[PDB]
Amino acid sequence: TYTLVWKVWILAVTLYYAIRIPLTLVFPSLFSPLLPLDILASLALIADIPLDLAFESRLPDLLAALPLDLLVFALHLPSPLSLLSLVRLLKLISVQRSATRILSYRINPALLRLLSLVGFILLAAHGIACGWMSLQPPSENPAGTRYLSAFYWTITTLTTIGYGDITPSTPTQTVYTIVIELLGAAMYGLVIGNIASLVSKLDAAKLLHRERVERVTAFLSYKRISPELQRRIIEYFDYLWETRRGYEEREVLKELPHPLRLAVAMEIHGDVIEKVPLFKGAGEEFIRDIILHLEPVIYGPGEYIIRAGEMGSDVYFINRGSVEVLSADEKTRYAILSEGQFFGEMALILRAPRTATVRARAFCDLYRLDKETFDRILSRYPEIAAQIQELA
């Protein structure tokens, strides 16, 4: 648990270094007023290099633990060597790899890469502004105003906006600008590429649904299906979207392993299958064999699940719809059936013609079991198969 607060402290420490090391390379007159925080931060980096072994390519941590900043600043070394103070910022590599561990289970990896990159671009912009100030001719301006002009220039460059009111006056500023321009083009390319990768996946389920609906309606239009049916199909896909988000129950349950697929099947059907009179008191092992072989099917409003006088072979279990059971002439209603009720169960005991028509009222999802799948499983429970056989 508390290691999260520690890695947030080490984030705050490396963020502190990423914002003071380049700034104190430009303004040494800031080094010592923040030396208490510097000692604390350096001791914190030293405290992290062993502690990173608790609840765990470690060279960036090893280098950032080394206090070359305190060395070059306290001894006032010349600038070309004083840049070795920047080894603290190697901790940003470790902290980015810490971020892709301590919040990658919670935050979308495309967006986490974007926030990590935007953070790096703001820290880079800060460092790049300090590089600009370092190359600028010495002048009597307030430190914040020269920094603001440098940060303005770098953001002008990195965003590729390029006003041109601040530009190189000297060769080394020009070389530096060439580098920071290429770096800004790369950074803004990474920003655009991250945002493209993120947006390309924001509604992937909805676009995948839309392209199945087009495939089905393009094909059906080629088959010259009537507008009434091609609407009972569009309305079905609208239902499947607004209920499930377009996913097939068959395809989703196949992406679960058998014990969890069984647990989900028990959670969905466990009460409704126990209350079938034909199964009353039969063993849990047999009920388990039923529920793993129940096939889902969706019926549209007004569609005939069962007619009358056809032989038939299936028993049905309402799960979210509702259903009307009707005389063979469809003139009179015998029942309304709702969630957790079943019909056609006589088809298990005898393959004989249907006594009543049955029609979905609203969109109606329900489960199906057939005398073939049923006989298959009863082949391995003779003790119940005999009961079914003698009931006829």
Ligand X SMILES: CCCCCCCC/C=C\CCCCCCCC(=O)O[C@H](COC(=O)CCCCCCCCCCCCCCC)COP(=O)(O)OCCN
- Among ligand X, its own copies, none, the one that 177 touches (CB under a kind-dependent 5 to 8 A) is its own copies
Please report whether residue 107 would count as binding its own copies according to CB under 8 A: no
- 62, 214, 271, 350: which one binds its own copies (CB under 8 A): 214
Q: How far apart are CA 89 and CA 66, in angstroms?
A: 11
Q: Report the distance separating Cα 47 and Cα 50, nearest Å.
A: 6
Residue 266, annotated as binding a ligand: no
* Residues 122, 126, 127: CA angle, nearest 5 degrees: 120
Which residues neighbour 142 within 8 Å (Cβ) at sequence distance 6 or greater?
none
Structure tokens, 40: 């604390």
188 contributes a contact to its own copies by CB under 8 A: yes
Distance between CA atoms of residues 188 and 200, nearest Å: 18
Q: Does 266 bind ligand X (CB under 6 A)?
A: no
Alpha-carbon distance 232 to 303, whole Å?
A: 10
Using DSSP's 3-state secondary structure scheme, residue 363 falls into: coil
* φ, ψ of residue 313 in degrees (nearest 5): -150, 10
- Near ligand X by CB under 6 A, which window of 183-191, 276-284, 332-340, 342-350? 183-191
Residue 207 site contact among ligand X, its own copies, none (CB < 5 to 8 Å, cut-off depends on kind): its own copies
Q: Are 344 and 307 in contact (CB under 8 A)?
A: no
Give which of ligand X, its own copies, none residue 280 binds (C-beta under 5 to 8 Å, depending on kind).
none
Question: Could you say which of ligand X, its own copies, none residue 47 binds, taking C-beta under 5 to 8 angstroms by partner kind?
Answer: none
**Residue 293 near residue 326 (C-beta atoms within 8 A):** no
Under the criterion CB under 6 A, does residue 12 sit at the interface with ligand X? no
- Choosing from 100, 134, 156, 217, the residue that interacts with ligand X (CB under 6 A) is 134
Q: Tell me if 33 contacts ligand X by CB under 6 A.
A: no
Give the whole-angstrom CA distance, residue 308 versus residue 216: 31
Residues that bind ligand X (CB under 6 A): 18, 22, 25-26, 79, 82-83, 86, 89, 92, 108, 111, 114, 118, 120-121, 123-124, 127, 130-131, 134-135, 144-145, 147-148, 151, 158-159, 170-172, 175, 178-179, 182, 184-189, 191, 195, 198, 202
Residue numbering of the annotated binding site for 3',5'-cyclic GMP: 344, 354-355
